[PDB]
Amino acid sequence: NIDNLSFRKDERGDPTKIATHMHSKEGEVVEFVEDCSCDGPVEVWLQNVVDSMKLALQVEFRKAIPTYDELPRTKWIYVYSAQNTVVVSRTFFTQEINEAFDDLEEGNEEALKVELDRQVQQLADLIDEINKEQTSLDRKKLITLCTIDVHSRDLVQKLIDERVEDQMCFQWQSQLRYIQSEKTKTCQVNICD
Amino acid sequence: MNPGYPGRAELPESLKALFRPVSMVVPDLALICEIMLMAEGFQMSKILSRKFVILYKLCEDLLSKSRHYDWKLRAIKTTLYVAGGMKRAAPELSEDKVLLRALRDFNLGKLTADDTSIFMGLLNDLFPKTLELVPRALDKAFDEAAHKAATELGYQPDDQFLLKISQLRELFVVRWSVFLLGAAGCGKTAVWRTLLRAQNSSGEKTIYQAVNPKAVTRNELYGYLHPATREWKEGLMSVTFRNMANNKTNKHQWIVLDGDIDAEWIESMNTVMDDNKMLTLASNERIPLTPSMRLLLEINHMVHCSPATVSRGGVIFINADDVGWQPVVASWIDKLEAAEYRPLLTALFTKYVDPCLEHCRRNFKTVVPLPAVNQAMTICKILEGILPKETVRGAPPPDKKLLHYHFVFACVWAFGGCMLVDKVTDYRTQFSKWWVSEWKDVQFPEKGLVYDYYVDEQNCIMVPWEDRVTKFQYIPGDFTSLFVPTVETTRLTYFLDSLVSNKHYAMFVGNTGTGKSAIMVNKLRNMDTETMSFYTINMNSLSEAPALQVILEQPLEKKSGVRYGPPGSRRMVYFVDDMNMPLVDKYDTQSSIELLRQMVDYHGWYDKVKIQLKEIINCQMAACM
Amino acid sequence: LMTDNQIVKEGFLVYINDLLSTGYIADLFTPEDKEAFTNAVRNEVKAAGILDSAENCWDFFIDKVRKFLHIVLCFSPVGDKFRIRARQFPALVNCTMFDWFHGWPGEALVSVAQRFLVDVPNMEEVVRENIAYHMAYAHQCVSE
Amino acid sequence: PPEGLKANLRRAWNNFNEEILESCAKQAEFRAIVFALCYFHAALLERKKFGVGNLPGARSGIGWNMNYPFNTGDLLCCGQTANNYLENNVKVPWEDLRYNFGEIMYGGHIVEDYDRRLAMCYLRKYVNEGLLDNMEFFPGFAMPPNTANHRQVLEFIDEVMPPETPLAFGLHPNAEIGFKLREAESFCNSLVQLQPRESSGEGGMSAEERAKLVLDEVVDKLPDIFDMEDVRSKINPDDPNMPFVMVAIQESERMNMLLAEMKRSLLELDLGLKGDLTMTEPMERLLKALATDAVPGSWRNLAYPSLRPLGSWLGNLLARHAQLVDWTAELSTPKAVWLSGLFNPQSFLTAVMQATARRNDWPLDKTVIITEVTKKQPDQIEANSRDGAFIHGLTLEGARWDDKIGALDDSKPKELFCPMPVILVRAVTQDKAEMKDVYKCPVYTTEARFREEVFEAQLKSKHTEIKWVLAGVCLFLDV
């Protein structure tokens, strides 16, 4: 994931060999948790800062769960990073689906309609900030979320036709789904077994 | 991957524990376009996709395909980009109406009229309320200055001129890689000429710089580190693109290129021809295109290119109505200003030009490819051949009679003058008789041959050219195979004499020694051979465009201008023995021939190495094959 | 005189091309050849009784070449490149006095057999000309 | 390899070890499924002895339209995951595995759904718990429910004999006639390559035949009256702005150029053989195509029956010309045409669909294809119209178009080749009735190649669609 590195200041001469955080692969800055110094024996602090990147992402995953008070708001879309907003949408919506069957109990259809409405209004504000002012990188975030939304509503219709066919059936089994064992801090993505 | 035939192919034999076959073969164009139209900010993009993706499947299945018709997802994406962008530039409407401006500016540029009918039908089957269809747009200043320029251009401002410049102007603000996909006689010249002159009349000054890509080797135009010296050779295109991409960011500029193409010298332009607009070079000069320069390519056919190649460039495919045979006729009408004859001549172009036109169209037919619009240019060349010897300032009846004679002659010599000659299937004199059966204002001689007939303009009698059986000579001198003209050569050389009186002339088609030498020496000896100076070259299948160009420039004085000029004041008439010897290239081009076309079109040249203009001052040609 | 056997490159016939189709070569003349050759020939024609402005030097130039060059061909058409090169340039048939060489006659057999069999021992004439016309016969049999 | 379902089957077993053939009867379904899938594999191979490429003959000689790559590695991987889930769960939810063993591991080397449905139906003919009770591969050779010891069933197929009925290979006994037709023409062209002659099919001249110039926006000419379905010509809700009129206009024009091309090439048959400025190498190479009696028509511009000699193929080529030079200009009327005379049959298909769309559906949506199955309730009768089109001579191969349904014709004379005589098809939007009563009939431009589908159809199948696709049926251009 590390395209480049992003530093604090000119500690130890050139900008701080303490790897404060990586530079995003697509071009952006993404923060670490612990910041280890480049000046040491290479591989060691390499391991350190890479693992810091990992731990940073997974703990901000942990953070984003209830701060998702409501949907990704114009607040929440931009307050939370691109990865934040998309990963939350992914796994949030996945457990929404896992509930949404009621596991072969009545109540799924209206729910499907509601999440399709989520797709509608979400795409709506995404398009709004495409038309209204938004940062080009945040517009890349916007189109990211649009392109999440399209598959989400695709799956909405997919399970509209696949009417009752749940995890006990093959069809929801087929779909992408995340056993969020973040009790262990893992997104145990568990498609067919 | 993707294999060749459904379900059967040619694959590795012993690689047998490493992969698992799955087939990802269905284009999801509806889904993807719907995605990008939410990216283009569209709400019924669901339904928009539902309609329009199938729309282009059906356009592919139905419309008369060509080299410049495609509905692959690439141009699909381009159209969606245009529609979304102008949608956010023209909000507050139904998404379909913006879609229809997109369609209107997109497909009408490339398609034909049958395609237009099919397109209207496909639209209104899905999209009723045709007031949607081709939604309203105004380019008032553009089209007024365009009609102005065309009138000033002499070309008839047939609002297909206005239509085409509308398309081009509205595409320039959309796409900078453009093609003027027309034809011979199309007056694409006139099209961009009206365009650029009118915009010069309205700011953002349109300085155009023409070149034929098939002039010299790709290296010289392109430029290169030398293959044996490793010095960077400057490239004409790259030099101009530094002069052009830079310091001409000031205002809207134009890079014109008349000719045609072949998939040999383009494959490296893939970083500036597209949106990338970034001329990366082998020596890495990295010349960036800016939105102050306009790329255009005045052309006829796409017989050598992949669709992905021309996908970057836009296609403005022209209708022949704006620069056509009757536009040629009325353009000449503009050119004549015989203040009293202008009321009289016009009807002749209907009672003579039209009937002789349909006669030549079906009543007789040829084996030599002839453009009828060039037959209009031919009759117009006869017109300025005969115009100075006409003065309507005198008595009107003799003037009108002599002019009626002139114009019926002009059909004879411009439409049977191009007809199949004798000795094939009875076409020449049969034309002549069936045409003099249609002379109306002035007496038509069914005696002998009107072919034979010069006409004593006063007394109105039709004198045979056998009055000019002279001259006669035959003797070995500083001798080779010998020639001498007689009657038909006298009439032919008088025709070319009236041509060169306007400095005009025509090319020549026919077998060797069919009078050729007699004709050339005849025209040489008639007047000051300093002026009537010639240059005979047989050009063969192996000597080609640079071998032609070197043998071009010996009489070419390079005097002020700088111009390829003749030595002193004279009018060279270069001779070509057989231009149809030179070989086509791998992409079927005898680039010597196209070099000649460049010579005659721009009336000048730039050396492959030099950056200097060498225009043409007074030259003529003599081209047999 | 030039032979297909002597022809190693058809570039040679390219350098014969403008001599015949055009009338004189520029195909092979190197630029120094054209320039200095023209300088010499112009002075020659000035000396040749033709003092002019221009272009009359090339006239006595045509004198000096075509009244003294008269190149002759000796090819066989079976190499079909014969007509191919003419298709590449008309000089091969432009002003070219074609001559049927022959096939090769039985009279050649007879008469050359008398021409050369004359010295062959034994001289015996009935036998030697029985031989001469037997060989005429046999050559015709071999041709058929 | 010595084949035969006994041989094929027991080394299909031997494609598995004992411990993964013979195992615990806890997973008795495991050994049952492995044995059923061994027979399944064996049967795929057996039918793979049939397919297309040199086929004017047996319909049962089509094991596969598009003959697909299978492998025993897939057999072993499916065996792995099956042992996985049957040691795991001796209980079986069918739809899961019936999607798995197909679409996600086997179906990837496939391009058409027809063979996918063929496999899933053929197995489901033997795949169920109701097919887990002494399952019949086909009568006379069954599945013994001793499904723990592989050695026991291995004995049982030491006692199963090789000679299986053709329908024990799930295919009617009509593979043989056209099968040896294939091998007959194989001997033919073999010995053809094995015997030299010079200038007899060249000595036989071939420039004796031509059609002439066709419409140039010149006429509206109408051979569009009767087919015994549309006994009289009809006009219905249509788009006469783009009816078949201009479609056939451009068809006739493009074929006019095509014929002019065959002319200007044929212009030099021996003129090429005796010209100097008029030698024609491509047709010089096609001179052998003339002589070798192979269609020199290679200027591929319309679909065509692929395997036909010059006489039949090119005479019927002229017949296609004739049929469509007649069927040039008919004022929007699309009825019984040969689907080969159409100089592009898909353009014709598009024309007829856009005609139906004003009638059989509404703007911004399209009708669906379904067939003429008789006995429709007498309320709102509208048949001889653009409710459907009319064709003649599409080969209804493997059944018979009798009682105006696909009638069983599979072991009966003229069953490899039945035609459609003629149909008024049905274009509708809600075709939601008679879907398993119908084989989903395709429409192809060929069977000798099965190169491409024109479109599909729903003909009333007299028997189960499972063995109906095991026999297969479709509609085509020609033989």
DSSP assignment of B133-178: SS-----HHHHHHHHHHHHHHSS---THHHHHHHHHHHHHTT-SBE
**At a CB cut-off of 8 Å and minimum separation 6, what does A191 contact?**
A173, A174, A175, A176, A177
Say yes or no for a CB contact (<8 Å) between B62 and D242: yes
Find the closest chain A residue to D104 by CA distance: A174
B17: DSSP letter: S
- For C80, other C-beta atoms within 10 Å of its C-beta total 8
Residue type, B412: V
Burial of A66 (0-12, 13-18, 19+ CB in 10 A): exposed
Say yes or no for a CB contact (<8 Å) between B125 and D71: no
Residues A52/A33, Cβ–Cβ less than 8 Å: yes
Of B468, B465, B445, give the one whose Cα is nearest residue B454. B465
Say yes or no for a CB contact (<8 Å) between B577 and C95: no
- For D172, other C-beta atoms within 10 Å of its C-beta total 23
Burial of D60 (0-12, 13-18, 19+ CB in 10 A): buried
| Cα–Cα distance, B608 to C5 (Å, whole number) | 40
**CB-CB neighbors (< 8 A) of D107 in chain B:** 22-23
Joined tokens for residue C105: 């006659």
Please say whether the dihedral angle defined by the alpha carbons of residues A162, A168, A170 and A171, taken in this order, is positive or negative. positive
| Cα–Cα distance, B221 to B237 (Å, whole number) | 6
**CB-CB neighbors (< 8 A) of B41 in chain A:** 127, 130-131
Say yes or no for a CB contact (<8 Å) between B540 and C14: yes
Residue D142's DSSP bridge partners are D136
Say yes or no for a CB contact (<8 Å) between A130 and B41: yes
Give the position of tokens 């033709």.
Answer: C50
Residue type, A179: I
**CB-CB neighbors (< 8 A) of B538 in chain C:** 17-18, 21-22, 89-91
Of D416, D425, D418, D432, give the one whose Cα is nearest residue D454. D425
Residues D145/D136, Cβ–Cβ less than 8 Å: no
Joined tokens for residue B122: 């496909």
- Report the phi/psi class of residue D464: left, alpha or beta, with left for phi > 0 and alpha for psi in -120 to 50: beta
Which site among A127, A152, A155 would you substitute to test the B interface, given the most B Cβ atoms closer than 10 Å to its Cβ? A127
**Alpha carbon distances (Å) from B604 to B207, B561, B563, B598, B618:** 18, 10, 7, 8, 11
Question: Which subunits sit against B, judged by 3+ Cβ pairs under 8 A?
Answer: A, C, D
**End-to-end CA distance of chain A, in Å?**
28
Q: What backbone torsions phi and psi does residue D93 show, to the nearest 5 degrees?
A: -85, 110
- Report helix, strand or coil for C109: helix
- Say if strands B620-623 and D426-428 run parallel, antiparallel, or are unpaired: unpaired
| Cα–Cα distance, D404 to D396 (Å, whole number) | 12
Of B63, B305, B30, B297, give the one whose Cα is nearest residue B175. B297
Helix axis angle for A136-161 and B29-39, nearest 10°, is 140
| Cα–Cα distance, A12 to A8 (Å, whole number) | 11
Longest CA pairwise span in chain C (Å): 75
| Cα–Cα distance, A117 to D97 (Å, whole number) | 34
Question: Which subunits sit against D, judged by 3+ Cβ pairs under 8 A?
Answer: A, B
Tell me the residues of A at the D interface, defined by beta carbons under 8 Å apart.
Answer: 168-170, 173-174
Q: Resolution of this PDB entry, in A? A: 7.5
| Cα–Cα distance, D265 to D282 (Å, whole number) | 8
Distance from B583 to chain C by nearest Cα, in Å?
A: 8
Nearest to D110 among B7, B51, B118 (CB): B7
| Cα–Cα distance, D311 to D309 (Å, whole number) | 6
Distance from B433 to chain D by nearest Cα, in Å?
A: 29
- For B525, other C-beta atoms within 10 Å of its C-beta total 10
Burial of B358 (0-12, 13-18, 19+ CB in 10 A): exposed
The structure's method of determination equals cryo-EM
Of D267, D269, D304, give the one whose Cα is nearest residue D288. D269
Interchain CB contact of D250 with B (< 8 Å): yes
The stretches of B28-90 forming alpha helices (DSSP H) are: 29-39, 45-62, 73-89
Taking CA D422 as the corner, what is the angle to CA D416 and CA D423, rounded to the nearest 5 degrees? 110
- For B446, other C-beta atoms within 10 Å of its C-beta total 11
Which site among B28, B31, B38 would you substitute to test the A interface, given the most A Cβ atoms closer than 10 Å to its Cβ? B38
Question: Which subunits sit against C, judged by 3+ Cβ pairs under 8 A?
Answer: B
Q: What distance lies between CA A33 and its chain's CA centroid?
A: 18
- Report the phi/psi class of residue D127: left, alpha or beta, with left for phi > 0 and alpha for psi in -120 to 50: beta
User: Any idea how long chain D is?
Assistant: 479
Of D444, D469, D473, give the one whose Cα is nearest residue D116. D469
Helix axis angle for B29-39 and B73-89, nearest 10°, is 20
Which site among B16, B48, B61 would you substitute to test the D interface, given the most D Cβ atoms closer than 10 Å to its Cβ? B61
Helix axis angle for D345-360 and B45-62, nearest 10°, is 140
The stretches of B502-568 forming alpha helices (DSSP H) are: 516-526, 545-552
Say yes or no for a CB contact (<8 Å) between B38 and A131: no
| Cα–Cα distance, B285 to B272 (Å, whole number) | 12
DSSP for D236-253, please give it: -S--TTSSHHHHHHHHHH
Starting at the edge strand found earlier in the chain, the sheet holding D337-338 runs D337-338, D390-395, D419-424
| Cα–Cα distance, D391 to D340 (Å, whole number) | 11
